[PDB]
Amino acid sequence: DEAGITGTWYNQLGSTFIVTAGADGALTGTYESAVGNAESRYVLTGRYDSAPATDGSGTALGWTVAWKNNYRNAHSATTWSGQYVGGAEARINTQWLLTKGTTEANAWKSTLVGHDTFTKVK
Amino acid sequence: DEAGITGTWYNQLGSTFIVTAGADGALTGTYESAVGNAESRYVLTGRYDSAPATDGSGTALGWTVAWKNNYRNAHSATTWSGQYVGGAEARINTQWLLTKGTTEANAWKSTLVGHDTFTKVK
Amino acid sequence: DEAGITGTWYNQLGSTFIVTAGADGALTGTYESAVGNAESRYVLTGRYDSAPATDGSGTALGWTVAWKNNYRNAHSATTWSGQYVGGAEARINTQWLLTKGTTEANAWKSTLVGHDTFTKVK
Amino acid sequence: DEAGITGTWYNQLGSTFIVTAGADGALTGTYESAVGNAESRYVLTGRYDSAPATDGSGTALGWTVAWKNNYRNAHSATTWSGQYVGGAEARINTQWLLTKGTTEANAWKSTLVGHDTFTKVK
Ligand SMILES: [Ir+4]
Ligand SMILES: [Ir+4]
Ligand SMILES: [Ir+4]
Ligand SMILES: [Ir+4]
């Protein structure tokens, strides 16, 4: 699935996700959010199962973005956990955790949860 | 915090997390779970905010492990979203998402959620 | 929104959710899952904000189902946290947590996470 | 476990959770948060598995609080999904989802995730 994951992806919020899969299971690329305190590109890095079960199952994968680059620092980070589903309508369906730096007093409200779907089009 | 994150960490389940922080905000290392379908070490990769707010806030960070190495393939992946808290009792408090490859029929039950705390001792 | 929430709802998995809103903010009804270890109806109970912000915001709400009734006991429970969005395309968008009874050894893998969308049609 | 769940519980944040279990599997009571936009008591309602597996497994359960009462309205709701563990150190370990009413534009950032542990003491 190294081939199928590599490329440009778009989510329901209009975010852009550009990624390269390594044969060992590495994922490198950049992310650009369409929402929130973000601006231009951010590095992403991750892992994917480089030998998925041959039974029509998705390919598990994950990545992280620290929301710091040359333009802004949102003092936060998001990780995406999900699976790549290939074929004629190729999808990466994910749930994500966004954590932001907080004082220990405010740690209870430090983590947002949500879900994104990525397609090759739009 | 590049200095404080780098090193060996242990969580409440007895898992071992060895990590190196880059100055640009990179996190590389290996993970060894004490539970589940895992055996020996797995690559991890991630991002961390390399310039945290000076106000006593934690440092946001995240990483991913694809549960595939030379011994086993659990066809799954876990991402950790959380923050590093330094000082005399240094902690990485996280929530994690574990996704496993599934058929689209079973995608509703593909994702486990939980939380880990890492300390330098134990 | 007491009026708009009350009624029969359907989610993307084909599940059926029948609910009555009280004026005090109570939610009572029954749930029938289309997937998993479930069969016929299960009681649900919950709360909703009975005075939402007049600014075009959704109405926060939640409910719980213990997966035990006269036919089966899945020894689990699911809670839905989300918001009701009214108008011509009325939606309840939720994320859900499904916890199952486990031994303390297996507690790390006790909780599934996912998301459901409910509409009045389909 | 109807007996063991009923009573007053306290979490790591210093919140107070007073609950009555019905024999059918109902949970009614009040919640008082020690943090956030809350003040005095809020109704809670929920479900619990009223016949847990005899194998040393926890008892699955869940509840909801809409953050509206006579004093304040936070336009939000939280659901707790978890299990009751009895014995000499009785615990309700939960993960929780807090959703707040938002505009559809801001729905991506509407949901906080976290975890609470409740004990009978402190
Ligand atoms: Ir979806
Ligand atoms: Ir904790
Ligand atoms: Ir959705
Ligand atoms: Ir805990």
Q: Distance from the CA of A36 to the center of ligand 2, in angstroms?
A: 27
| DSSP per residue, B69-108 | SSS-EEEEEEEEEEEEE-STT-EEEEEEEEEE---GGGGG
Which among D45, D61, D107 is the nearest to C93, CB-wise?
D107
Residues A46, A27 contacting (CB under 8 angstroms): yes
CA distance A43 to A51: 25
Ligand nearest to the CA of D91: 4
Q: Where chain B is broken, by preceding residue (C–N > 2.5 Å)? A: none
Q: Distance from the CA of B82 to the center of ligand 2, in angstroms?
A: 11
- The CA-based diameter of chain A, rounded to the nearest angstrom, is 48
Residues C60, C48 contacting (CB under 8 angstroms): yes
Q: How many other β-carbons are positioned within 10 Å of the β-carbon of residue A56?
A: 13
CA distance A19 to A1: 13
Record: contact A103-B55, CB cut-off 8 A: yes
Can you read off the two tokens belonging to residue B101?
């490859």
| A63 assigned ligand-binding residue | no
Q: Tell me the residue type at D15.
A: S
Residues B29, B41 contacting (CB under 8 angstroms): no
Number of folded domains in chain C?
1
> Chain A to chain B, count of Cβ pairs less than 8 Å apart?
196
Tell me the C-alpha to C-alpha distance, in Å, between residue A106 and each of A100, A101, B57, D35, D114.
10, 9, 9, 9, 12
Contacts with C115 from chain A: Cβ below 8 Å? 95, 115
| C71 assigned ligand-binding residue | no
Nearest CA in chain D to B114: D95
* A98 CA: distance to closest CA in chain D (Å): 9
3-state SS track over A68-116:
ECCCCEEEEEEEEEEEEECCCCCEEEEEEEEEECCCHHHHHHCEEEEEE
CB neighbours of C21 closer than 8 A, spacing ≥ 6? C1, C2, C3, C5, C6, C27, C48, C50
Backbone angles phi, psi at C18, to 5 degrees: -105, 125
Q: Which residue's entry shows tokens 């959620």?
A: B113
Nearest CA in chain C to A114: C95
Q: How many other β-carbons are positioned within 10 Å of the β-carbon of residue C89?
A: 9
* Full residue range of the structural domain in which residue A103 is found: 1-122
Residues C4, C85 contacting (CB under 8 angstroms): no
Residues B50, B40 contacting (CB under 8 angstroms): no
Q: Which residue in A68, A73, A80, A90 sits closest to A1, CA to CA?
A: A90
Nearest CA in chain B to D82: B114
Please report, for the domain that includes residue D94, its CATH number.
2.40.128.30
Backbone angles phi, psi at B2, to 5 degrees: -45, -45
Can you read off the two tokens belonging to residue B69?
């190495």
Q: Tell me the residue type at A68.
A: K
* Coil, helix or strand at residue A35: coil
Can you read off the two tokens belonging to residue D72?
């304040």
| C31 assigned ligand-binding residue | yes
- Report the structure determination method: X-ray
Selected for mutation to probe chain D from C43, C49, C89 (highest D CB count within 10 Å) is C49
Element (H, E) at D51: none
Cα–chain-centroid distance for residue B51? 20
- Give this entry's resolution in angstroms: 2.5
Q: Tell me the residue type at B89.
A: E
CA distance A78 to B17: 19
Selected for mutation to probe chain C from B15, B98, B113, B115 (highest C CB count within 10 Å) is B113
Q: How many other β-carbons are positioned within 10 Å of the β-carbon of residue B104?
A: 14
